[PDB]
């Protein structure tokens, strides 16, 4: 229903994380990633597939990626860690 | 004998047709009817009956008889007592009510809803409880200075022990849908301690409250479909 | 001068008065009556026990604790051993009866709780085994006076012996419908701050005109605790629920020797 | 139509319709003109589709029957030559759930039979066009033992002969109940187990299934055996018309596990738990 | 009829109809009796075919659906067994262009299903005659996961069963819009992205496609698997009747590239350049 | 029941026909109309 | 051209300042900077030719004849009443058909000022304030 | 000649139907009846 391909991400503090969240539908009425992290967009052709470009990763976050397919609201998260010396 | 011509749509079996058919039991003297009480003439006679909302369907208390009583106390917090969207066919706590089960056979619905709230505390427990309905398209109300601005009702506790918060038909479309749709979203509903609930000594502090749902007499449905409870 | 909270009901030589009542529910808007001649199924002479069985019968008082989960009675068979209605019943093959169910439970003004008093036509319940289907014995389905209790857990016994009984699950109301939808039945709610008695008036509801009371159980009386009992000094107190039922407008057919059902 | 909405304005008086008491048994009664200020809305929307004649006005599916047609040698191959189905509406879960809203109902039933075929093997020749018998056996008429016995000739049983490739056969069965309505739910047995019986009927089934005999729909293939094995599928349909219903009930929430009101252990949890009580 | 032509002759006066001013918004208003001398022409020609009931009075094609029927082994072979199509008029470019003359429309829709078959392989046996299910799924009813699940039995969904070889099945769908007219063009979203959301709905689609749910037409083959793989093609048709329209618009000039009003870069040049301005 | 005879042109689908058809949604209470401005009654209103 | 029907909220609703057209269609390959109106002048945005736009209610400001264009616009929508925050009913469009040409100063600027009045307004469903996103 | 449409249940043979049929012996002057004693009008005359 909603797939996030980079599920297991390791990346240090401050860098950028590429998150790819799409749905298993043909018409994503309402789709987005819920996090308070800065992101513009990443260019990707196709009305279904989608990449947000997250940046300035400081702490451990679990963003939720909804998708309003015509069978209810769906849910998919991703798991990301940080690094420190 | 008679010149006829066969149109398209001949020799089809449509599952919603209305045709005649030869009776396989000719001259069957049917059993004469008697006046059985409680005859239903319309499925909207069943929408106008109250039925409890599983409002307390949190992790642990769901799927048991603690799903219905809403927790109350005497502390008088600013937090909402409950909060629920107005989607009586696709919300996780409304689609299993008697109104919610009929709406999952239909697709488009209009009309206003009726929330009758029974207070099941003690006799000496007096209090005031705000009951609010906010139309959609803004911030979901969390504090009391956000839900006072909508359609609300301030309810007092005492002898007459059941209020009625009405959620009116305020909608862009003539017919909202029976799914979680963004364009036909219903509204935001909260419930705040107006002043607080006060108990004396020798009286329980933590109490409960029951929550109902029915349909106003301008409530009507269309477009019969299958449901999504059973398989 | 008059109020809705004071009500006296008299049938035969029995009387219920109540001073903190709610209003009474006539079920589906029809008061019970005798079988009219334009609908009569048998042709024998009907016995009308005019005042000998149209009177209030008081059942046993169950105790409603804080952990009590529900009760159920099958209505033309909870009166199977009550006076002459239990003697009009087993000496006749046919029987119709209206009912006046009056449920009695009262506490102080410091208690709290709710009691959904229902009256369910054709209250068909589920068996407590997964070996077979529609599989309940006679004694376990017809307890009579004492009734039965609900339960907040479904434990189907793998034995076909101890599984011949009602899987009385409270939130599925026995028959696998949700309990929050049970208000489409004729119901009243005993709320311990508002009232202390629930009065229903139940006509004879069956597809047939008149039917065997020994086989067929017409109504199902159901009492669900919606909000549990909570008394703040003594959290484990018990207030009794006493059920008082009267037959109304009874009519019987097919006289013979006494029917004595099995007890095991 | 449905009710309109009157032009009302605000009030300040002792007449309070917003406060009811559901201990009395009655539901809520406040229409939205009571508690707020409303405009005048002329309401032309009707409730015409929600009525029981249109709520049951679909030809639902109640079962799927399979017959075959080949040179039968063993005994299990001779029982594939026909199929006898006990007529009931409980062999699916969607027309049943629409009928268990109501305790008692009264309706003339209209059936239609949509029938498919296939070759079983690939290189066993061919077959001619086929004619299908569907015979309504009332309770008491002899059910067929073999596919070509004395019972299929149907001197009084209602039979239909569908030539394969035509429009599906349709017929209307009247109200055939021996009660004054079909008891969807029957809370009682078929007999009374007496005191000190040597019969020991401690296996009498509960409830509904001990009173319903509606018949038997026995289906054969009227042809003899073709060289190619023809496997058929038949989908018996029902459409309640002239519908009346009595004494409404809550609808089925948890799944079924039989012909009764029973429910299986692994699906006693119909709800999905929300995050908290404050989740829009 | 259309307007006739009056017998007029030449004029010399201050009444000048040949001069208008299109800054005022009104179009030209001079009929040919004004600026020249005309005879009397009785005009019997009517505009009967140009009306909207006859301008849309054709059964257009809106999509082409493909189902098959064979012994499915893998998972991609089980998704060839059925096809679910979201109902819209935008999957072709000719009935769409006739409807995007108008902003809002109101019409009862009449559909007809013209269905073909073929053998896939050559020497894999044969097959019997086939029956096709076409089930109208409203928004909310469960879409089928496999080709033989609980959803196809259709206890309340409108289904038609077309026996292959008959006349094509036809049905009329009423005005099912939740507005008072079908918005062909919708200039707005489905929701309002609020200030300081943690939701971050920066991928809400523009315009029309976020409000239209008309249903799902799910088609299976009711037969089981034949020995020969039968590949089918189904051409869903629409014919708007009882047509009303509002608020006209210019017609589509450049080609489409989606379900919106978008246009692709390589075809933004619909005209062909003439030699010069003085080319007859 | 009634002796009929099938003419040529039976069981055809003509894309410009005018026939009746069974409504797949029986008793659909359609949404009541309102007076939307600028109603077109004919495509020759747009030629002028 | 990555996606279809694909415009953000801020880029589709500028408010007071409005937007401008353009005589060139340059679709950005970024899905970031492509969430805006491809305001092409001769295709009028929606891919219909601009010479057919006179089927709308229109007036032509001609600098020898007039100096003001007044239209009176009723509420046009399929619904009776609708959300103004979601749905934008009308579209005001000003196309220069013949370009400005002043013979001494060929690069002069004359201002177009747009003055709009609501008429016969009516609102429903009171609540707290809706504040949309700004980015 | 006349636009018709074939419903379901066409071209079936139901063994309890009531339809008309072409007489294979047109104009058969049937043998005139006489009053035979003991006429049964109903099978419930034999139950009594």
Swiss-Prot record, chain A:
Domain Ig-like C2-type: 14-76
Consequence when changing residue 29 to M: Probable risk factor for cerebral malaria at homozygosity
Disulfide bonds: 21-65, 25-69
Induction details: Up-regulated by coagulation factor Xa (F10) in atrial tissues. Up-regulated in atrial tissues by rapid pacing resembling atrial fibrillation.
Localization, UniProt: Membrane
Post-translational events: Monoubiquitinated, which is promoted by MARCH9 and leads to endocytosis.
Family: Belongs to the immunoglobulin superfamily. ICAM family.
Subunit structure: Homodimer. Interacts with MUC1 and promotes cell aggregation in epithelial cells. Interacts with ARHGEF26/SGEF. Interacts (on T cell side) with CD81, CD247 and CD9 at immunological synapses between antigen-presenting cells and T cells.
Functional summary from the UniProt entry: ICAM proteins are ligands for the leukocyte adhesion protein LFA-1 (integrin alpha-L/beta-2). During leukocyte trans-endothelial migration, ICAM1 engagement promotes the assembly of endothelial apical cups through ARHGEF26/SGEF and RHOG activation.
Record-given protein name: Intercellular adhesion molecule 1
First-to-last residue of the parent protein present: 28 to 112 of 532
């Amino acid at each position: 229903q909603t797939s996030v391909s980079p599920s297991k991400v390791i990346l240090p503090r401050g860098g950028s994380v590429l998150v790819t969240c799409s749905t298993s539908c043909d018409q994503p009425k309402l789709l987005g990633i819920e996090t308070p992290l800065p992101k513009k967009e990443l260019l990707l052709p196709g009305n279904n597939r989608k990449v947000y470009e997250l940046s300035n990763v400081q702490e451990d976050s679990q963003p939720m990626c909804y998708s309003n397919c015509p069978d209810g609201q769906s849910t998919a998260k991703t798991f990301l860690t940080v690094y420190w010396t | 004998g008679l010149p006829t011509m066969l149109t398209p749509g001949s020799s089809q079996f449509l599952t919603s047709d209305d045709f005649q058919s030869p009776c396989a039991l000719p001259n069957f003297d049917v059993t004469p009817p008697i006046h059985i009480p409680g005859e239903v003439f319309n499925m909207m006679e069943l929408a106008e009956i109250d039925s409890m909302i599983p409002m307390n369907s949190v992790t642990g208390k769901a799927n048991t008889m603690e799903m219905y009583p809403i927790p109350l106390d005497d502390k008088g917090s600013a937090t909402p007592i409950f909060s629920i969207s107005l989607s009586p066919a696709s919300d996780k706590r409304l689609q299993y009510t008697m109104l919610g089960e009929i709406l999952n056979y239909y697709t488009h619905w209009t009309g206003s809803l009726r929330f009758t709230f029974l207070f099941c505390g003690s006799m000496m427990a007096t209090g005031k409880i705000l009951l609010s309905y906010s139309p959609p398209g803004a911030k979901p109300p969390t504090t009391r200075k956000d839900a006072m601005l909508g359609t609300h009702i301030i309810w007092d506790l005492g002898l007459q022990s059941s209020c009625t918060m009405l959620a009116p038909w305020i909608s862009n479309t003539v017919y909202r849908r029976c799914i979680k749709d963004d364009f036909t979203e219903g509204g935001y509903i909260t419930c705040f301690y107006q002043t607080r609930i006060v108990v004396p000594s020798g009286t329980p502090t933590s109490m409960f409250m029951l929550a109902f749902v029915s349909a106003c007499p301008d409530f009507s449905v269309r477009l019969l479909r299958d449901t999504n409870h059973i398989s | 001068g008059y109020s809705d909270r004071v009500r006296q009901i008299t049938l035969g030589n029995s009387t219920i008065t109540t001073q903190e009542a709610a209003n009474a529910v006539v079920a589906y808007g029809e008061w019970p009556s005798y079988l009219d001649d334009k609908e009569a199924n048998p042709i024998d002479a009907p016995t009308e026990p005019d005042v000998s069985s149209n009177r209030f019968y008081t059942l046993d008082s169950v105790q409603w604790k804080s952990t009590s989960r529900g009760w159920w009675w099958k209505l033309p068979d909870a009166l199977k051993d009550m006076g002459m209605f239990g003697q009009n019943m087993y000496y006749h093959y046919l029987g119709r009866s209206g009912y006046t169910v009056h449920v009695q439970c009262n506490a102080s003004k410091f208690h709290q709780g709710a009691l959904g008093v229902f009256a369910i036509p054709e209250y068909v319940m589920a068996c407590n085994t997964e070996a077979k289907t529609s599989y309940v014995s006679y004694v376990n389905a017809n307890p009579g006076e004492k009734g039965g209790v609900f339960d907040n857990a479904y434990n189907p016994s793998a034995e076909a012996s101890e599984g011949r009984k009602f899987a009385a699950l409270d939130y599925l109301l026995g028959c696998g419908v949700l309990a929050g939808n049970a208000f489409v039945y004729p119901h009243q709610i005993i709320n311990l701050r508002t009232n202390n008695s629930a009065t229903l008036v139940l006509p004879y509801v069956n597809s047939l005109a008149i039917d065997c009371m020994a086989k067929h159980n017409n109504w199902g009386l159901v009492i669900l605790p919606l909000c549990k009992l909570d008394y703040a000094p003594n959290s484990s107190t018990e207030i009794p629920i006493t059920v008082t039922i009267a037959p109304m407008f009874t009519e019987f057919n097919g006289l013979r020797n006494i029917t004595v059902p099995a007890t095991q | 139509t449905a009710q309109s909405t009157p032009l009302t304005s605000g009030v300040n008086s002792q007449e309070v319709p917003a406060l009811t008491a559901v201990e009395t048994g009655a539901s809520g009664q406040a229409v939205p003109s009571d508690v707020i200020e409303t405009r005048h809305v002329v309401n032309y929307k009707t409730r015409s589709e929600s009525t029981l004649e249109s709520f049951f006005g679909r030809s639902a599916c109640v079962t799927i029957l399979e017959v075959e047609n080949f040179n039968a040698t063993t005994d299990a191959d001779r029982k594939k030559q026909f199929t006898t189905w006990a007529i009931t509406y409980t062999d699916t879960v969607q027309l049943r759930r629409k009928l268990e809203f109501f305790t008692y109902s009264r309706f003339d039933l209209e059936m239609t039979f949509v029938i498919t075929e296939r070759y079983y093997a690939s290189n066993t020749g061919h077959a001619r066009n086929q004619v299908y018998q569907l015979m309504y056996i009332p309770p008491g008429a002899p059910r067929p033992t073999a596919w070509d016995d004395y019972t299929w000739q149907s001197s009084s049983n209602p039979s239909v002969f569908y030539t394969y490739g035509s429009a599906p056969p349709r017929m209307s069965i009247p109200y055939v109940g021996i009660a004054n309505a079909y008891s969807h739910f029957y809370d009682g047995f078929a007999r009374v187990p007496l005191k000190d019986e040597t019969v020991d009927s401690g296996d009498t089934y509960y409830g509904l299934v001990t009173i319903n005999d509606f018949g038997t729909l026995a289906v054969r293939v009227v042809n003899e055996y073709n060289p190619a094995r023809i496997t058929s599928k038949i989908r018996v349909y029902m459409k309640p018309k002239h519908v009346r219903c009595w004494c409404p009930r809550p609808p089925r929430a948890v799944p079924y596990r039989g012909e009764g009101v029973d429910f299986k252990q692994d699906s006693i949890t119909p709800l999905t738990a929300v995050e908290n009580i404050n989740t829009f």
